[PDB]
Symmetry: D2
Subunit: 393 residues, 4 copies
Amino acid sequence: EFDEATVQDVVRLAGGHDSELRELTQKYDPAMISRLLVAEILSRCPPPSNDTPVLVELAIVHGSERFRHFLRVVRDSPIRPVGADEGFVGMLVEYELTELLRELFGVTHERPAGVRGTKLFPYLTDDEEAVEQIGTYLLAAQQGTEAVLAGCGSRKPDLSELSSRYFTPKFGFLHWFTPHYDRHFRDYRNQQVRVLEIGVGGYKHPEWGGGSLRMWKSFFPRGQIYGLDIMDKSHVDELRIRTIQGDQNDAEFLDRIARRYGPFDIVIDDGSHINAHVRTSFAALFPHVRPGGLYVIEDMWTAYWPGFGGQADPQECSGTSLGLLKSLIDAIQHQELPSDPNRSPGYVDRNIVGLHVYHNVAFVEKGRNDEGGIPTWIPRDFESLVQASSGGA
Amino acid sequence: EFDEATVQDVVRLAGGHDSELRELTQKYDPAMISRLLVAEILSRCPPPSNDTPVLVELAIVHGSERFRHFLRVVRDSPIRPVGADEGFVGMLVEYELTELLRELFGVTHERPAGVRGTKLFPYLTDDEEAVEQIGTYLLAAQQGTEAVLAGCGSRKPDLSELSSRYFTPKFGFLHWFTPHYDRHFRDYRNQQVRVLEIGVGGYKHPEWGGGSLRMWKSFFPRGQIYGLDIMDKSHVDELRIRTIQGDQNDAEFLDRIARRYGPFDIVIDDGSHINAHVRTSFAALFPHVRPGGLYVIEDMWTAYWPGFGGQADPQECSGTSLGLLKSLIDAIQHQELPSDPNRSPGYVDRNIVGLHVYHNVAFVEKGRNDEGGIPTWIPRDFESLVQASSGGA
Amino acid sequence: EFDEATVQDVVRLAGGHDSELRELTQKYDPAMISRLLVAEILSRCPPPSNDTPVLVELAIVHGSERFRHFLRVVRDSPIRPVGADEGFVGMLVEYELTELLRELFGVTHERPAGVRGTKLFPYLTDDEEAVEQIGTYLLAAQQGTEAVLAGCGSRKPDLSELSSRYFTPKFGFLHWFTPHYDRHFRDYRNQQVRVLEIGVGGYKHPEWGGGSLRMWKSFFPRGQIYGLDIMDKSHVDELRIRTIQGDQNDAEFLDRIARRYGPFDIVIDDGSHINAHVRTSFAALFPHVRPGGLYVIEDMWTAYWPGFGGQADPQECSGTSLGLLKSLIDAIQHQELPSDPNRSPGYVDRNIVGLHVYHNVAFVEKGRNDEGGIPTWIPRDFESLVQASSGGAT
Amino acid sequence: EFDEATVQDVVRLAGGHDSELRELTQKYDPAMISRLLVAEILSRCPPPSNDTPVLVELAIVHGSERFRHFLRVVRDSPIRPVGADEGFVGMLVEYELTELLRELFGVTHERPAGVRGTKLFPYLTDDEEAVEQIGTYLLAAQQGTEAVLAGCGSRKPDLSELSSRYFTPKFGFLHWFTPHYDRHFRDYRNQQVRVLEIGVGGYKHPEWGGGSLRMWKSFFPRGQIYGLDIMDKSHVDELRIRTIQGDQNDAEFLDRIARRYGPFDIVIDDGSHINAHVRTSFAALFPHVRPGGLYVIEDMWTAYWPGFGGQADPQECSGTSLGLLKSLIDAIQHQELPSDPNRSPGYVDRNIVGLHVYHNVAFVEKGRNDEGGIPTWIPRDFESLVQASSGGAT
Ligand SMILES: Nc1ncnc2c1ncn2[C@@H]1O[C@H](CSCC[C@H](N)C(=O)O)[C@@H](O)[C@H]1O
Ligand SMILES: Nc1ncnc2c1ncn2[C@@H]1O[C@H](CSCC[C@H](N)C(=O)O)[C@@H](O)[C@H]1O
Ligand SMILES: Nc1ncnc2c1ncn2[C@@H]1O[C@H](CSCC[C@H](N)C(=O)O)[C@@H](O)[C@H]1O
Ligand SMILES: Nc1ncnc2c1ncn2[C@@H]1O[C@H](CSCC[C@H](N)C(=O)O)[C@@H](O)[C@H]1O
Ligand SMILES: [Mg+2]
Ligand SMILES: [Mg+2]
Ligand SMILES: [Mg+2]
Ligand SMILES: [Mg+2]
């Protein structure tokens, strides 16, 4: 539907001040921008709760133009555009194009009022039949409007709820990841993030997968989401979600896609869960995580299982994902090693500043690890330290 | 020192992703950007607490270039650059140019580590008299470094403390404004705001004034501050602060400066406090407040005083700043008036969505006031409403 | 079963440290506390989304005791305690009693893990019949568990969504209040608030009303909610929600109930919308709002309508709700009035520190208004002020 | 003067609603409560910036009683109570006793106005002598008042700044810990925390140490701070800070003090940095951390140094603090281990739900680790998992 470079540019300019919003609406056809925003809104809207179907008219204004979209809203159906004559219009919602840009893709504070105009029952002519129409549609029009307006803003969603909405197992039964994802990701939400997740989902099934990609799209209103899978997943692609076919164990492939699409604020490994793959992808992609970014590994349970290249004995971890996580502790501490002119700190040593481990999910913080080791003039035995620190007492 | 349009462009690009940061460093000379960032850092640093004077070397790296700045840090003096030989270097602080841009002017999450490199006592050769140097400088180097690093980030300051630091009476004695300012302004801090304050301070004194402008500059890390005063205040101008000479009671002048420098996220009237002036400035400048922005009026105490054009009787308020505020309540409510084809809502009616009043300070929220009045089918008397709302009971 | 004084005492102690949690479970029978917590959980749970009915076992543990509750979870039905044999148990959720107290009623940080134990398919025999059962109940058990767990915590809800859920017109069609309520109320959520709303809803209908009271109960996990209505609303009452029958225009009655149930952190007038009533209730109840609390008035539109005692001319506001709000501006500013020996500041003058007005909703901040007026040595005319502030410069 | 049990009880009640505040001021002598609050305020005040010495009168009112405290405020000196005649009174600050309790020790929202009354130059006679006094004391009174008022609230401090102020090496030169401490601790600030830090500071010096204990007291307005040191540190003790003399390597002693003073929301090891000691203290004290609490270890650098019982080879970590941290990863993952009837999960296994490692500082999250391992019906090899997850597609 929309060119990815264009969408990213729209998001980039929408994040600016008045001059950037004006630049955007000058650079691109306002009609096209309007269609882009409607596409985003349709994916952003929560599930409708109204049993009686209603229409919500969304009118987008720019200059002398008015782009009218009639949205059919009913429980157990996705919100979709229809013809004006295809139901009862419960509400007219009016946005200025630049205001809707700010609300969806802007860097903005929460605005409790004044972002739009609203005209209830906009075509209900005041005659004898009106009272009947009011009784039938009053509740449904309130519920339908609430759903559409929720899709016109950037309010922070509940990851646990999105997980269930999108049929991904991140929370609720096998796993309990989303509170950790929320804590680690929420501070990135006003940024134009590039997120790469390895493992789109659905494996060989021709129709399944994409639930977690949808989740990140919903969570990051200004984000671009990339999903990597060995199987074709092009049926998942939509506005702000691109899938790529390839093997996470192919370092040459990883180089090309990282240099094409990166650098990434967030990389998540939810792929094969083969231990060697986890290690290969980390080695290849950690360099392409932005400073201040995150590398996440999901499902370390496979570290203990030979069928995934793991080992039943937790101490025999040299080739496992948990062996990697343990080594990252030494990487963090590398500046504390006794000096050796024959030893140079490696890339990971120099570039990890935090490790967070929870049950079956770990977060690695990318950044410059150059705080300085304990200086040579601090004693390297306890008694000497006490003496040095006691001021002659 | 620096071209205002360049500074604004630097801040605009610094708020972007990797591509915008690369664009910035390609567009402008990295040496010039380095000097710009140092200028910002020097204004951002808190007062040093160290009694013993130390140097903190700040090295800014970009490609093969390394821009070194030696900052003299001592209690009761502003941090300033000096020659490398002008004291003991307690700390070397290393930043990549693009990382420092992000930390000062970026749209960024809080980064608790990994933004810089640090090398303590960087030139202290390990001979016999190092012990002496360590004892003299250990505490001062810690304190000096803490001060410099505070100036290298975008942590939210305390407005009440800035008010004392910059000698403005917003808090502590006559007035208690800063907690309200903090509550209303804090959500704007990751935006590239344009703030206009009427009333620079110092009146006719050739050297005084500018304290509140410095406060806003400190509070809004990506902001451009404008100060309007009838007296010349050009001595106040610095990076991100421009003063303008003119009369707040001159509507033509206000049009020109608003269209030249606006639209404004925030406008504050702290000027003459003449009631007619407050009302004139509001009428002229409210249209130039951005939707989602704020118009602030300070010092409404003058509403009661003839010498400022006010009235001792609080009921005789048709020409006072408090009369204005009272009328804003009706403006907010204007859609609830009974219909009249001879009456059109005015500009303020259509554009106010909130009013906040505290002792001697009021905040007006700019936005589209078009929610819809109570529909005609809601009864206009109590009994009729009760009967209509009771379902036949 | 649950005495109001007991519930409030449970909430009070639950907000404490380890010594208070131990005190609570020693003071009261753990079995009763367990039932009370389950009652709360049932009201907190979001609507279930699973088509296939499942059971979630909630086991509350204290000492050598284990209180087992089997909760039936299915879309379009309220979550209800059933017998162990009345369905497939998709999940066992285990909470220590003191931990569940902290999670529902405590003053606590967000805890992303470690508050409970979970055992999926807890009674599913590992045999040839398992695979079909897994296929049938996997998604339903996940969705069922999520709904229950959401009810076992204190996460802030979306007020706008609750408006549609509880059928109150605070947001979505006629009004757009909830974002303002959220901004003004969210900072109170870890306090044991007492909230009084005038106007329960439903008017004379024998079944309708209570939606906004439910909303405040959900928003304030440690709160006690009171609803006043001229009509009987006893069918609305549930844990942490009490309704009172009476007239908001009776000042002596208002003082009686305020003494009995106050002081209130929050009072909301969403009642008759008769202008005289709004003014009577405010004068009577503002003194019973806590310092740091809020008095809220909803639906000021009636200020312009003679059918509610209003006036079409906005300047004729001496008897309207908007006239009251305008007067609150002068009350805030009262210390700035010129000196007068026979004029003394009134109660409202001395006790208002903020006013917030939005379309059809206003928030009044109760607190000590005693900052001091501009001192007499600050000049009372512009030209003299310039001179006094210029340090001799001419 | 102030009994520790009494201080903790005051904080406990101050955190309640109106009924608890009334109970507090009925249970204890209001004059004593006012002295207690003044002692707290004095420790909370930031360094004064005014060159000219001023007095700020703090008047605490309860019932018909008025407790007057005259505070001397000048740069480079701690704020201290003096006689009324010992300087110029720049400002009178008035608090009701229950309001000051809420502001210092309450569970409260931020209140931007209405908490107090202020009367500038309260005893300055309006005559020909006033103008000179105003000129001398205007700026000093403003800055003086600002310092005192900052001490009368519960605003979050900057931990990095406090590190410089209290002379502790947590941030600025050798270490860069405070941003991590802020991130992990800030959500606890509303709670009546019990914090134990091993290592008070100063080692054998008779006067040095205590900086980090002061830091935690400042950061946690409702907290009780405990500091363990092998050396006597009784000179550090003040309101809400207790030092304990003893050896962190004595597990039986550690259990004794943990029973006496716990359970702890937060334990920090910043002690000897001997590897055996770090491991002993963790095993002994982790059971005494509350669910939802934190165990913090500082200065793991010593893991690499034989002079602290460490090893230069990072792989030789079986006895080091880093070996402990690595093992906690397996503890977190313990439910994923293949079945073994003779193997039983240990205490740490069952009670760790998170691990955070930064340069020279690590945070361990205490909680119930009982989420359940991957079920037996999820295939234990990649190829079988592909097949089971592909719905028949080949
Ligand atoms: N070597 C490899 N490289 C890339 N993807 C692989 C792979 N081996 C398996 N996969 C894919 O990894 C996916 C794991 S399932 C991913 C689930 C998804 N993240 C969610 O939460 O909804 C499967 O779709 C599988 O096809
Ligand atoms: N008609 C007019 N137009 C613009 N500025 C005016 C004016 N009359 C007075 N002023 C200026 O308004 C200022 C008021 S004092 C401003 C103080 C400043 N906002 C602070 O907080 O520090 C004086 O500097 C005075 O010169
Ligand atoms: N004099 C009076 N005193 C108290 N309540 C009154 C009253 N006159 C009318 N009411 C009640 O005020 C209510 C107004 S409707 C309240 C709606 C509710 N707050 C909600 O948001 O869902 C009606 O139930 C009506 O019975
Ligand atoms: N075995 C032991 N048990 C308890 N404390 C010990 C100990 N060995 C050394 N110590 C104490 O541990 C302290 C380490 S220095 C602590 C510094 C302090 N936390 C701060 O940040 O300012 C010294 O005071 C030393 O006396
Ligand atoms: Mg997964
Ligand atoms: Mg002013
Ligand atoms: Mg209402
Ligand atoms: Mg230490």
